[PDB]
Design a binder for this molecule. Structure first.
Ligand code: SAH
Ligand code: SAH
Lengths: 225, 231
């Protein structure tokens, strides 16, 4: 609903940046996600990354809660790449997709921290409906360490007035899922974690102390039984 | 989010730095005039979420009797270093209404200063916190509450885009890493008004960094505040 707003304002604005620059986890995906299966990009947004995943996967469906995102994404449609609206909370939509495309792998980039922790049960049921017993999910999320990285950065290049560092902290509300809490979310719902590492994305922009801001991510790959 | 962990790390260093080290008054508590004008002058002051005790040392040089309280034992262990006659530091969880009542019986009816405390806790604990506030203030007492605006996330986003840009592809991913504050000026007003508070004084304050970004721009920490009385 607020994500519908965000994609209307972003789309007021083929070729590909570099290699594994877009998807540095790609080798992990090909290693753990059967390529013979179709791939759903849950929370595909404007389809940029979905397009780049398609270079490697022959049957790809991006889906997203926002109709703006899908409409913009739909621009990139081709044979073997397709886009559709789907709320990860709407298990009956997930069922309808599963029965269309078949058992499928599912890649999420940023989706769990994109929604209320109360919608996670439904989202994970959706993932389970899409995967059946042959499909696997690749899920990557920005860690609570991101807020620690913004706190540090405000700390030295935009310090709050004196004695106001902890009030600044109060406004820096972290994400819920680190490495262990991502693994607990999948395991407590009946998933087998096949793989699970961390991953950092540096900024090409040089901060005054010759440091580079680091965006901290964490991913796992999971399957049912 | 984990306030004992924060304060043990910050308190791991420091001999507490008197307030005159960091500023010459005005900059620590720009809002003090709004407090002198609308709070009752005779009542003791509670600093809810007092932390290491810096701002409460400052306030206790304008207010005869002041008690700073915080969830975090570490925070209070450090704050107690600043202790002197008329300046007092205790462990109080704003949730724990029983503890809030025990203070009210000891201290008497009080004014309460809150900095950041409502966004420092879970919206689920807000009804309990407002009850703690009603218990300390009684009839005569009032609250000054100041909170970092929801548009802080927007300021951080602007900063990051300009000097710490995300990897190409990661812009939307990084917007989700921004868990937004929920009390803007209209929302902080409602929370107090829908729980039987009268709002005497409500405005917005912008507290600026002295550090100059490479842009030439200065970082603007967006605040909002109000003074509330039990109706
Ligand atoms: N319940 C839900 N179901 C599906 N998508 C959702 C959702 N809640 C949020 N989203 C989507 O999740 C995305 C989060 S950020 C965009 C992620 C995208 N794969 C990328 O890296 O570019 C947004 O597109 C948002 O619209
Ligand atoms: N439930 C709760 N009850 C009491 N204090 C709390 C609390 N949750 C958070 N706090 C405290 O509220 C503060 C929020 S930020 C710190 C503001 C403080 N006046 C200062 O300038 O340092 C922290 O000190 C934190 O320890």
């Amino acid at each position: 609903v607020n994500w519908e707003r965000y994609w209307r304002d972003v789309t007021s604005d083929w070729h590909f940046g570099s290699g594994a620059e877009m998807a540095p986890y790609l080798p992990v995906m090909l290693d753990h996600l059967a390529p013979e299966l179709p791939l759903v990009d849950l929370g595909c947004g404007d389809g940029l990354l979905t397009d780049h995943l398609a270079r490697h996967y022959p049957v790809v469906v991006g889906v997203d809660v926002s109709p703006a995102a899908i409409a913009a994404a739909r621009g990139r449609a081709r044979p073997g790449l397709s886009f559709d609206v789907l709320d990860a909370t709407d298990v009956e939509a997930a069922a309808r997709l599963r029965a269309t495309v078949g058992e499928a792998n599912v890649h999420l980039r940023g989706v769990l921290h994109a929604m209320d922790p109360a919608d996670w049960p439904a989202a994970l049921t959706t993932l389970a409906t899409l995967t059946g017993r042959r499909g696997r999910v690749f899920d990557i999320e920005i860690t609570p360490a991101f807020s620690d990285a913004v706190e540090e950065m405000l700390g030295k290049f935009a310090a709050p007035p004196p004695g106001m560092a902890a009030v600044a902290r109060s406004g820096l509300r972290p994400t819920e899922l680190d490495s262990p809490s991502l693994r607990a979310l999948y395991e407590d719902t009946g998933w087998t974690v096949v793989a699970a590492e961390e991953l950092t994305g540096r900024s090409t922009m040089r901060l005054p102390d010759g440091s580079y801001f680091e965006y901290p991510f964490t991913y796992l790959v999971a399957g049912r039984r």
